[model samples]
Target: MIHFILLFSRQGKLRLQKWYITLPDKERKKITREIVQIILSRGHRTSSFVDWKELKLVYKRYASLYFCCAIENQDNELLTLEIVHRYVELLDKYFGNVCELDIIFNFEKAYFILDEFIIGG
Candidate 1:
């Protein structure tokens, strides 16, 4: 099961947030902030996936944006990685190049593109 998707900027500011699993506002904020800090701690290609609590946080970086998802214990990390890249490909085809600005300006469309990939994850 997929818990949520978070899109963050190079500055560590969240751009777009999608929660597949409902959570309390306070809990969501705390978790998201913690995850964001971890992802933006440094610039390295060492590890894109990490074990957090009981879930896995898989992410990918492109330009100034980070696409990440919180998945179940048994989920395929490699497939999730591909899914992130696949979403970027779709975004690029929909909007030239697909940068952070493109996602910000067309957030809803971006969400729709995500739906095309994962409907009820």
Candidate 2:
């Protein structure tokens, strides 16, 4: 199951976030910071999949954006990767080639797209 999803730019600026589990605001901020750092520091040579804490992080880079998802340890990484790609495809179709600027300006639409794609995953 998906615990959360995060969308950020290559510069490590967060563009969007969605949480499926409950957590303290402080903890959420902390996790976002750490996950962003961990993902940004990784080189392209490294696999997109990584073990983060007790969960698994499955992320993919597309153009100038990074899509990351946190999932239960027992979850399938490949399936999660497909879900992320499907989300991107939906965004692309919705925005006619979506970009960082499109997501930034229409964040609510982005959230809506995500909500439609997955609910409480």
lDDT computed for candidate 1: 0.86
Residue pairs whose backbone atoms clash in candidate 1: none
lDDT of each residue in 48-115, candidate 1, tens digit only:
68788898899988888989998987899888898889988998999989688877788899888888
Give the winner by TM-score: 2
The numbered model that scores best in lDDT is 2
lDDT of 2 by residue, 6-114 (tens): 9998888999999998999899999999999999889874665889998999999888999999998899988899999999999999999869998899999999999
Could you tell me the lDDT of residue 66 within candidate 2?
90
Error of 2 at 49 (Å): 1.1
TM-score for each predicted model, relative to the true structure: 0.92, 0.95
